[PDB]
């Protein structure tokens, strides 16, 4: 066993999936989102 | 009784009489309407 204090990254879980049930694998990216930015702040406008 | 003087039987004064009466009045003041902490709120978003 061994530890990391490590939350920038993952760097630590690689491999090629080999079935759609596949657990082990590295990491693939995701979908690119925006903003979506919306404060609950007593009186925010509106930016619509 | 009668050995102890008479005013050995209890707490002793310690503030005098006239500085009770300052001292009653800061704090009357400064516990009455003048506080400012205040206890609970609610969190909902609403458009009002």
Do not use: W, Y
Not at chain 2, 5 to 28: D, G, V
């Amino acid at each position: 066993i061994t530890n990391a204090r490590t939350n920038n990254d993952e760097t630590h879980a690689t491999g090629p999936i080999e079935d759609l049930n596949s657990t082990s694998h590295g990491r693939e990216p995701e979908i690119e989102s925006f903003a979506d930015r919306a404060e609950l702040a007593m009186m925010i406008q509106g930016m619509t | 009784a009668n050995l102890d003087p008479a005013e050995f039987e209890n707490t002793p004064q310690l503030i005098e009489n006239s500085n009770m009466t300052r001292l009653q009045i800061a704090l009357k003041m400064l516990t009455g309407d003048m506080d400012d902490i205040v206890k609970g709120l609610i969190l909902h978003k609403r458009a009002c």
